[PDB]
Short mmCIF file of N, CA and C in Angstrom, two decimals:
data_model
loop_
_atom_site.label_atom_id
_atom_site.label_comp_id
_atom_site.label_asym_id
_atom_site.label_seq_id
_atom_site.Cartn_x
_atom_site.Cartn_y
_atom_site.Cartn_z
N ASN A 1 0.84 -1.19 0.00
CA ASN A 1 0.00 0.00 0.00
C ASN A 1 0.88 1.24 0.00
N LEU A 2 0.78 2.04 -1.06
CA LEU A 2 1.63 3.23 -1.17
C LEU A 2 1.23 4.30 -0.17
N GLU A 3 -0.07 4.41 0.14
CA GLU A 3 -0.49 5.39 1.13
C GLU A 3 0.11 5.09 2.50
N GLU A 4 0.08 3.82 2.91
CA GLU A 4 0.68 3.44 4.18
C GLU A 4 2.19 3.68 4.16
N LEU A 5 2.84 3.38 3.03
CA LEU A 5 4.28 3.60 2.93
C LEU A 5 4.62 5.08 3.08
N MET A 6 3.84 5.95 2.44
CA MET A 6 4.08 7.39 2.55
C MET A 6 3.77 7.90 3.95
N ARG A 7 2.74 7.34 4.60
CA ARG A 7 2.38 7.80 5.94
C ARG A 7 3.43 7.39 6.96
N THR A 8 3.89 6.14 6.90
CA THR A 8 4.83 5.63 7.89
C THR A 8 6.28 5.95 7.56
N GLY A 9 6.61 6.06 6.27
CA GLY A 9 7.97 6.39 5.88
C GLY A 9 8.96 5.25 6.00
N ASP A 10 8.50 4.04 6.29
CA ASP A 10 9.38 2.88 6.41
C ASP A 10 9.50 2.21 5.05
N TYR A 11 10.66 2.36 4.41
CA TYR A 11 10.90 1.84 3.08
C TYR A 11 11.73 0.56 3.09
N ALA A 12 11.80 -0.12 4.24
CA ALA A 12 12.60 -1.34 4.33
C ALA A 12 12.02 -2.44 3.44
N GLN A 13 10.71 -2.65 3.51
CA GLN A 13 10.10 -3.74 2.75
C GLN A 13 10.21 -3.51 1.25
N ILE A 14 9.84 -2.31 0.80
CA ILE A 14 9.87 -2.03 -0.64
C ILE A 14 11.30 -2.03 -1.15
N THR A 15 12.24 -1.50 -0.36
CA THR A 15 13.64 -1.54 -0.76
C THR A 15 14.14 -2.97 -0.88
N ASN A 16 13.79 -3.82 0.08
CA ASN A 16 14.21 -5.21 0.02
C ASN A 16 13.61 -5.91 -1.20
N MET A 17 12.34 -5.65 -1.49
CA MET A 17 11.70 -6.29 -2.63
C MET A 17 12.28 -5.79 -3.95
N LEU A 18 12.64 -4.51 -4.02
CA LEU A 18 13.19 -3.97 -5.26
C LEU A 18 14.63 -4.43 -5.47
N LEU A 19 15.40 -4.56 -4.40
CA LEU A 19 16.78 -5.01 -4.54
C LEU A 19 16.86 -6.50 -4.86
N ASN A 20 15.90 -7.28 -4.37
CA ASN A 20 15.90 -8.72 -4.55
C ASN A 20 15.07 -9.17 -5.75
N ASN A 21 14.52 -8.24 -6.52
CA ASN A 21 13.73 -8.56 -7.71
C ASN A 21 12.56 -9.48 -7.36
N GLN A 22 11.89 -9.18 -6.26
CA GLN A 22 10.75 -9.98 -5.81
C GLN A 22 9.47 -9.40 -6.40
N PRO A 23 8.70 -10.16 -7.18
CA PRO A 23 7.50 -9.58 -7.80
C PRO A 23 6.55 -9.00 -6.76
N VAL A 24 6.01 -7.83 -7.06
CA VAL A 24 5.17 -7.09 -6.13
C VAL A 24 4.17 -6.26 -6.92
N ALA A 25 3.21 -5.68 -6.21
CA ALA A 25 2.26 -4.72 -6.79
C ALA A 25 2.18 -3.52 -5.85
N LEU A 26 2.64 -2.37 -6.32
CA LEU A 26 2.51 -1.12 -5.58
C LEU A 26 1.14 -0.53 -5.87
N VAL A 27 0.30 -0.45 -4.84
CA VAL A 27 -1.11 -0.12 -4.99
C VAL A 27 -1.34 1.30 -4.49
N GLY A 28 -1.99 2.10 -5.31
CA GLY A 28 -2.31 3.47 -4.96
C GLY A 28 -2.43 4.33 -6.19
N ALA A 29 -3.20 5.40 -6.06
CA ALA A 29 -3.38 6.33 -7.16
C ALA A 29 -2.03 6.91 -7.57
N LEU A 30 -1.62 6.59 -8.80
CA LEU A 30 -0.33 7.00 -9.33
C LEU A 30 -0.52 7.67 -10.68
N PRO A 31 0.31 8.66 -11.01
CA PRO A 31 0.37 9.11 -12.40
C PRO A 31 1.27 8.20 -13.21
N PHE A 32 0.99 8.13 -14.51
CA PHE A 32 1.75 7.26 -15.40
C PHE A 32 2.10 8.01 -16.67
N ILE A 33 3.18 7.56 -17.31
CA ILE A 33 3.62 8.09 -18.60
C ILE A 33 3.11 7.15 -19.68
N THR A 34 2.37 7.71 -20.64
CA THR A 34 1.90 6.94 -21.79
C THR A 34 2.95 7.03 -22.88
N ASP A 35 3.65 5.92 -23.12
CA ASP A 35 4.71 5.84 -24.11
C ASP A 35 4.28 4.89 -25.22
N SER A 36 4.20 5.40 -26.44
CA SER A 36 3.73 4.63 -27.58
C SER A 36 4.87 4.09 -28.44
N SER A 37 6.11 4.18 -27.95
CA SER A 37 7.27 3.77 -28.73
C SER A 37 7.53 2.28 -28.53
N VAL A 38 7.60 1.55 -29.64
CA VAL A 38 7.93 0.12 -29.57
C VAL A 38 9.38 -0.07 -29.15
N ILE A 39 10.27 0.82 -29.60
CA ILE A 39 11.67 0.71 -29.22
C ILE A 39 11.83 0.92 -27.72
N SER A 40 11.02 1.80 -27.14
CA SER A 40 11.05 1.98 -25.69
C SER A 40 10.64 0.70 -24.97
N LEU A 41 9.62 0.01 -25.48
CA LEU A 41 9.21 -1.25 -24.88
C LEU A 41 10.29 -2.31 -25.00
N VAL A 42 10.93 -2.40 -26.17
CA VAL A 42 12.00 -3.38 -26.35
C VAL A 42 13.17 -3.06 -25.43
N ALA A 43 13.43 -1.77 -25.21
CA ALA A 43 14.49 -1.35 -24.30
C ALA A 43 14.14 -1.57 -22.84
N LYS A 44 12.88 -1.90 -22.53
CA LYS A 44 12.47 -2.26 -21.17
C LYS A 44 12.59 -1.05 -20.23
N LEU A 45 12.14 0.11 -20.72
CA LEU A 45 12.22 1.32 -19.91
C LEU A 45 11.26 1.28 -18.73
N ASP A 46 10.14 0.57 -18.85
CA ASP A 46 9.18 0.52 -17.76
C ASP A 46 9.79 -0.08 -16.50
N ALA A 47 10.78 -0.95 -16.66
CA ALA A 47 11.43 -1.58 -15.52
C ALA A 47 12.50 -0.70 -14.88
N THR A 48 12.76 0.48 -15.44
CA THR A 48 13.83 1.34 -14.95
C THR A 48 13.34 2.46 -14.05
N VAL A 49 12.04 2.51 -13.74
CA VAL A 49 11.45 3.67 -13.07
C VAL A 49 11.26 3.44 -11.57
N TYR B 1 58.50 -2.07 12.04
CA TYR B 1 59.66 -1.24 11.77
C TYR B 1 60.76 -1.48 12.80
N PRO B 2 62.03 -1.48 12.39
CA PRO B 2 63.11 -1.50 13.38
C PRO B 2 63.17 -0.21 14.17
N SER B 3 63.54 -0.33 15.44
CA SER B 3 63.66 0.81 16.33
C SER B 3 64.80 0.55 17.31
N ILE B 4 65.41 1.63 17.78
CA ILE B 4 66.43 1.59 18.83
C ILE B 4 65.86 2.31 20.03
N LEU B 5 65.76 1.61 21.15
CA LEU B 5 65.11 2.16 22.34
C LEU B 5 65.78 1.61 23.58
N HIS B 6 65.86 2.45 24.61
CA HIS B 6 66.22 1.97 25.93
C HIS B 6 65.12 1.04 26.43
N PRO B 7 65.45 0.03 27.25
CA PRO B 7 64.40 -0.90 27.69
C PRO B 7 63.19 -0.23 28.33
N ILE B 8 63.39 0.86 29.07
CA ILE B 8 62.25 1.57 29.65
C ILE B 8 61.45 2.28 28.56
N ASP B 9 62.15 2.93 27.62
CA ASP B 9 61.46 3.55 26.50
C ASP B 9 60.72 2.51 25.68
N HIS B 10 61.34 1.35 25.46
CA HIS B 10 60.65 0.29 24.75
C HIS B 10 59.43 -0.18 25.53
N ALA B 11 59.53 -0.27 26.85
CA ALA B 11 58.38 -0.67 27.65
C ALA B 11 57.22 0.29 27.44
N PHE B 12 57.50 1.59 27.51
CA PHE B 12 56.43 2.58 27.34
C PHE B 12 55.83 2.52 25.94
N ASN B 13 56.68 2.50 24.92
CA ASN B 13 56.19 2.49 23.54
C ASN B 13 55.42 1.21 23.24
N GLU B 14 55.92 0.07 23.72
CA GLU B 14 55.23 -1.20 23.54
C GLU B 14 53.88 -1.19 24.23
N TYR B 15 53.80 -0.63 25.44
CA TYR B 15 52.51 -0.54 26.10
C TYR B 15 51.55 0.32 25.28
N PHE B 16 52.03 1.45 24.76
CA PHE B 16 51.16 2.28 23.93
C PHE B 16 50.69 1.52 22.70
N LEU B 17 51.59 0.79 22.04
CA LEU B 17 51.22 0.05 20.84
C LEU B 17 50.22 -1.06 21.14
N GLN B 18 50.41 -1.77 22.25
CA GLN B 18 49.64 -2.97 22.55
C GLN B 18 48.29 -2.68 23.18
N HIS B 19 48.06 -1.46 23.66
CA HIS B 19 46.86 -1.12 24.43
C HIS B 19 46.22 0.14 23.88
N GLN B 20 46.05 0.20 22.56
CA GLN B 20 45.39 1.34 21.94
C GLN B 20 43.89 1.30 22.22
N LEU B 21 43.29 2.48 22.30
CA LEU B 21 41.88 2.61 22.64
C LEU B 21 40.96 2.54 21.43
N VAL B 22 41.49 2.52 20.22
CA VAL B 22 40.66 2.46 19.02
C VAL B 22 40.16 1.03 18.83
N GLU B 23 38.94 0.91 18.31
CA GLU B 23 38.32 -0.37 18.05
C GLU B 23 37.61 -0.31 16.71
N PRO B 24 37.42 -1.45 16.04
CA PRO B 24 36.75 -1.43 14.73
C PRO B 24 35.35 -0.84 14.82
N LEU B 25 34.97 -0.12 13.78
CA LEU B 25 33.67 0.53 13.69
C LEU B 25 32.95 0.04 12.45
N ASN B 26 31.70 -0.39 12.63
CA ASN B 26 30.86 -0.83 11.52
C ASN B 26 29.45 -0.30 11.74
N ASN B 27 28.61 -0.51 10.73
CA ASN B 27 27.23 -0.02 10.80
C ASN B 27 26.48 -0.65 11.96
N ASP B 28 26.82 -1.89 12.32
CA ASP B 28 26.16 -2.54 13.45
C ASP B 28 26.44 -1.80 14.75
N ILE B 29 27.69 -1.37 14.95
CA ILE B 29 28.04 -0.65 16.17
C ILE B 29 27.29 0.68 16.23
N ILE B 30 27.22 1.39 15.11
CA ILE B 30 26.50 2.66 15.09
C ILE B 30 25.02 2.43 15.37
N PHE B 31 24.44 1.40 14.76
CA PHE B 31 23.02 1.12 14.97
C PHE B 31 22.74 0.79 16.43
N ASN B 32 23.60 -0.01 17.06
CA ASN B 32 23.43 -0.30 18.48
C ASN B 32 23.70 0.93 19.34
N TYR B 33 24.49 1.88 18.84
CA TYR B 33 24.76 3.09 19.60
C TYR B 33 23.50 3.93 19.77
N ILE B 34 22.58 3.85 18.83
CA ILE B 34 21.30 4.57 18.97
C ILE B 34 20.52 3.96 20.13
N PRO B 35 19.86 4.75 20.97
CA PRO B 35 19.06 4.16 22.05
C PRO B 35 18.00 3.22 21.49
N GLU B 36 17.81 2.09 22.19
CA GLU B 36 16.94 1.04 21.67
C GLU B 36 15.50 1.53 21.54
N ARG B 37 15.00 2.26 22.53
CA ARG B 37 13.63 2.73 22.49
C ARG B 37 13.39 3.71 21.35
N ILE B 38 14.44 4.36 20.84
CA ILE B 38 14.28 5.21 19.67
C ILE B 38 14.32 4.38 18.39
N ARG B 39 15.04 3.26 18.41
CA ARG B 39 15.07 2.39 17.24
C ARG B 39 13.76 1.63 17.08
N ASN B 40 13.04 1.41 18.18
CA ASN B 40 11.75 0.73 18.14
C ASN B 40 10.58 1.69 17.98
N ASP B 41 10.83 2.99 17.99
CA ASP B 41 9.76 3.97 17.83
C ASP B 41 9.45 4.14 16.35
N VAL B 42 8.18 3.91 15.98
CA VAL B 42 7.78 4.00 14.58
C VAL B 42 7.68 5.44 14.08
N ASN B 43 7.76 6.42 14.97
CA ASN B 43 7.72 7.81 14.55
C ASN B 43 9.04 8.28 13.97
N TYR B 44 10.12 7.54 14.21
CA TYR B 44 11.45 7.89 13.72
C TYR B 44 11.92 6.81 12.76
N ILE B 45 12.29 7.23 11.55
CA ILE B 45 12.83 6.33 10.53
C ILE B 45 14.33 6.54 10.49
N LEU B 46 15.07 5.49 10.81
CA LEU B 46 16.53 5.53 10.87
C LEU B 46 17.09 4.67 9.75
N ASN B 47 18.04 5.23 9.00
CA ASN B 47 18.65 4.55 7.87
C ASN B 47 20.16 4.71 7.96
N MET B 48 20.86 3.74 7.37
CA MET B 48 22.32 3.74 7.32
C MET B 48 22.72 3.93 5.86
N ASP B 49 22.84 5.19 5.45
CA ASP B 49 23.17 5.54 4.07
C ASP B 49 24.65 5.85 3.90
N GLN C 1 75.91 0.77 29.82
CA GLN C 1 76.48 0.77 28.48
C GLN C 1 75.38 0.57 27.45
N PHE C 2 75.55 1.18 26.28
CA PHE C 2 74.64 0.94 25.18
C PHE C 2 74.93 -0.41 24.55
N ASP C 3 73.90 -1.24 24.43
CA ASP C 3 73.99 -2.55 23.79
C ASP C 3 73.02 -2.56 22.62
N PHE C 4 73.55 -2.78 21.41
CA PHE C 4 72.69 -2.76 20.23
C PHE C 4 71.68 -3.90 20.27
N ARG C 5 72.11 -5.09 20.68
CA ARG C 5 71.21 -6.24 20.69
C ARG C 5 70.06 -6.02 21.66
N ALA C 6 70.33 -5.41 22.81
CA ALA C 6 69.31 -5.16 23.82
C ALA C 6 68.49 -3.91 23.54
N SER C 7 68.82 -3.16 22.48
CA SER C 7 68.11 -1.94 22.13
C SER C 7 67.32 -2.04 20.84
N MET C 8 67.66 -2.98 19.97
CA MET C 8 66.96 -3.13 18.70
C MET C 8 65.67 -3.91 18.92
N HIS C 9 64.56 -3.31 18.50
CA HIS C 9 63.25 -3.94 18.59
C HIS C 9 62.52 -3.76 17.27
N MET C 10 61.47 -4.55 17.08
CA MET C 10 60.57 -4.42 15.94
C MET C 10 59.23 -3.93 16.48
N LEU C 11 58.93 -2.65 16.24
CA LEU C 11 57.66 -2.09 16.66
C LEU C 11 56.60 -2.38 15.62
N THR C 12 55.45 -2.89 16.07
CA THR C 12 54.37 -3.32 15.19
C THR C 12 53.13 -2.48 15.44
N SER C 13 52.45 -2.12 14.36
CA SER C 13 51.18 -1.41 14.47
C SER C 13 50.39 -1.65 13.18
N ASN C 14 49.29 -0.93 13.03
CA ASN C 14 48.51 -1.00 11.80
C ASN C 14 49.08 -0.03 10.77
N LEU C 15 48.83 -0.33 9.49
CA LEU C 15 49.31 0.54 8.43
C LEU C 15 48.55 1.87 8.42
N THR C 16 47.22 1.81 8.50
CA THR C 16 46.43 3.03 8.48
C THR C 16 45.00 2.70 8.90
N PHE C 17 44.37 3.66 9.57
CA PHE C 17 42.94 3.61 9.82
C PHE C 17 42.45 5.03 10.08
N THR C 18 41.14 5.21 10.00
CA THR C 18 40.50 6.49 10.27
C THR C 18 39.62 6.35 11.51
N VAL C 19 39.80 7.25 12.46
CA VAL C 19 39.05 7.25 13.71
C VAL C 19 37.91 8.24 13.59
N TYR C 20 36.72 7.82 14.02
CA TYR C 20 35.52 8.65 13.96
C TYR C 20 35.02 8.92 15.37
N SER C 21 34.45 10.11 15.56
CA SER C 21 33.92 10.54 16.85
C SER C 21 32.40 10.59 16.87
N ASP C 22 31.79 11.23 15.89
CA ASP C 22 30.33 11.35 15.82
C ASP C 22 29.78 10.13 15.10
N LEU C 23 29.31 9.15 15.87
CA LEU C 23 28.71 7.97 15.27
C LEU C 23 27.32 8.27 14.71
N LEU C 24 26.55 9.11 15.40
CA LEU C 24 25.20 9.42 14.94
C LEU C 24 25.19 10.27 13.68
N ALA C 25 26.33 10.84 13.29
CA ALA C 25 26.41 11.51 12.00
C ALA C 25 26.26 10.53 10.84
N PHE C 26 26.49 9.24 11.08
CA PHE C 26 26.33 8.21 10.07
C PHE C 26 24.89 7.73 9.95
N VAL C 27 23.98 8.25 10.76
CA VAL C 27 22.58 7.83 10.77
C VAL C 27 21.76 8.90 10.07
N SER C 28 21.02 8.49 9.04
CA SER C 28 20.02 9.34 8.40
C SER C 28 18.73 9.18 9.19
N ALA C 29 18.34 10.24 9.90
CA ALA C 29 17.19 10.20 10.79
C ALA C 29 16.10 11.10 10.25
N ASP C 30 14.90 10.55 10.10
CA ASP C 30 13.73 11.29 9.65
C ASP C 30 12.58 10.99 10.60
N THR C 31 11.52 11.78 10.51
CA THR C 31 10.36 11.62 11.36
C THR C 31 9.10 11.66 10.51
N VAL C 32 8.08 10.92 10.96
CA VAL C 32 6.78 10.94 10.31
C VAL C 32 6.18 12.33 10.49
N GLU C 33 5.15 12.64 9.71
CA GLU C 33 4.45 13.90 9.93
C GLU C 33 3.81 13.88 11.32
N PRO C 34 3.88 14.99 12.07
CA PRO C 34 3.37 14.94 13.45
C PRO C 34 1.90 14.57 13.54
N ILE C 35 1.12 14.84 12.49
CA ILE C 35 -0.29 14.46 12.49
C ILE C 35 -0.43 12.95 12.65
N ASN C 36 0.53 12.18 12.14
CA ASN C 36 0.48 10.72 12.17
C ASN C 36 1.37 10.12 13.25
N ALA C 37 1.94 10.94 14.13
CA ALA C 37 2.76 10.41 15.21
C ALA C 37 1.90 9.65 16.20
N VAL C 38 2.41 8.51 16.67
CA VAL C 38 1.66 7.61 17.54
C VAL C 38 2.44 7.39 18.83
N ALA C 39 1.71 6.95 19.85
CA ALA C 39 2.28 6.70 21.16
C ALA C 39 2.66 5.22 21.30
N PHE C 40 3.01 4.80 22.51
CA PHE C 40 3.48 3.44 22.73
C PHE C 40 2.41 2.40 22.40
N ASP C 41 1.14 2.77 22.42
CA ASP C 41 0.04 1.85 22.15
C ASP C 41 -0.40 1.89 20.69
N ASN C 42 0.40 2.49 19.81
CA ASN C 42 0.18 2.58 18.37
C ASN C 42 -1.03 3.43 18.01
N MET C 43 -1.66 4.10 18.97
CA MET C 43 -2.67 5.10 18.68
C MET C 43 -2.00 6.47 18.57
N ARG C 44 -2.64 7.36 17.82
CA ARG C 44 -2.09 8.69 17.63
C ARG C 44 -1.97 9.41 18.96
N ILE C 45 -0.89 10.19 19.11
CA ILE C 45 -0.66 10.91 20.36
C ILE C 45 -1.83 11.84 20.65
N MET C 46 -2.26 12.60 19.64
CA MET C 46 -3.39 13.51 19.75
C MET C 46 -4.47 13.06 18.78
N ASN C 47 -5.68 12.82 19.31
CA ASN C 47 -6.77 12.26 18.52
C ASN C 47 -7.92 13.22 18.30
N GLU C 48 -7.97 14.35 19.02
CA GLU C 48 -9.06 15.31 18.87
C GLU C 48 -8.81 16.16 17.62
N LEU C 49 -9.10 15.55 16.48
CA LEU C 49 -8.87 16.18 15.18
C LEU C 49 -10.18 16.34 14.42
#
């Protein structure tokens, strides 16, 4: 839960999951970038954010 | 290193060398240096950056 | 009398190290927003909101 993460400020769990490549779902109202480039998808830019 | 010393001077210098007050320092020592009740308080987020 | 054999010693120490004084300077310390600060019972310190 992103709201709970922002409220508590404890980033241990999310940092551990991101460093260990553990599949997760970050839940919460987020803005997103709409990218229509196929080369961007092949370059796997979505995984770099 | 080689040194030339009177036995009393050697005694003093050897005592200084053998009984230094410095000790290894790591993130664990710093983390334990923080008071425990502050490390368990969820209002404070402590990180080792 | 000066005796070379009784005066020659090998003094031993470390090659190099760095000594630190402020251990808490190595700690990145942050706090939650005071609105969300909680007491020992995990309830908010002030609830009349």
